[PDB]
From Swiss-Prot, chain A:
The keyword DNA repair applies. Its main location: nucleus. The chain holds residues 7 to 124 of 401 of the full protein. This is Chromatin modification-related protein EAF3. Transmembrane segments: none annotated. Residues 7-78 form the Tudor-knot domain.
Curated annotation (Swiss-Prot), chain C:
Signal peptide: none annotated. Present with 486 molecules/cell in log phase SD medium. Catalytic component of the RPD3C(S) histone deacetylase complex responsible for the deacetylation of lysine residues on the N-terminal part of the core histones (H2A, H2B, H3 and H4). Histone deacetylation gives a tag for epigenetic repression and plays an important role in transcriptional regulation, cell cycle progression, DNA damage response, osmotic stress response and developmental events. Component of the RPD3C(S) complex composed of at least EAF3, RCO1, RPD3, SIN3, and UME1. This is Transcriptional regulatory protein RCO1. It is found in: Nucleus.
Length: 104, 65, 20
């Protein structure tokens, strides 16, 4: 569900984008654990203040370039289960219906 | 007699349930340690200990009296 | 873990009572 290297599905507007977790944030220690890991917030690494104090995660979007890595907290990063897949498919179908309404 | 555990279903259709007696509640092996036919009991682990204890007690008194 | 303790003391006393 939520672990280093594990898959995750995060909201982005009226649709979700699946990503893989790379860093796990610990707000209590002001620290993130990464994998090739006790280490402070990076010199170029930072998290938005609304998720600096929450359980944030560094994720990479699959099908997207490595430059689209994002720090997403528990607010949008959902638990990857059957409900998550069904709900991703549901909002994909709703996006398809919105596109068809824009067309026909 | 044959006993089997239920199969894995999608958690969309999974109907988890928790009892209230917490001491005596006859359940199948579909328990959870912490179409309305595949309800998995949330067993309240201490209830496992209790249920084991008086079960051993009954197994004693069947041959003791 | 005290409810179990008192319950088992009561059941054991009843058990010796039935097996005097």
């Amino acid at each position: 569900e939520f672990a280093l290297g594990g898959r995750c599905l995060a909201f982005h507007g009226p649709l979700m984008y699946e990503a893989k977790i790379l860093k796990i944030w610990d707000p209590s220690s002001k620290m993130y654990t990464s994998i090739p890991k006790p280490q402070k917030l990076g010199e170029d690494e930072s998290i938005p203040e609304e998720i600096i104090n929450g359980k944030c995660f560094f994720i990479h979007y699959q099908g997207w370039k490595s430059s689209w890595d994002e720090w997403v907290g528990y607010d949008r990063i959902r638990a990857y289960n059957e409900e998550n897949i069904a709900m991703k498919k549901r909002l994909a179908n709703e996006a398809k219906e919105a596109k068809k309404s824009l067309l026909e | 007699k044959v006993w089997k555990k239920q199969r894995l279903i999608n958690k969309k259709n999974q109907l988890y349930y928790e009892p209230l007696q917490k001491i005596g509640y006859q359940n199948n092996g579909n328990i959870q340690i912490i179409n309305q036919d595949f309800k998995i009991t949330q067993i309240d682990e201490n209830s496992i200990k209790y249920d084991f204890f008086d079960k051993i007690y009954k197994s004693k008194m069947v041959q003791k009296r």
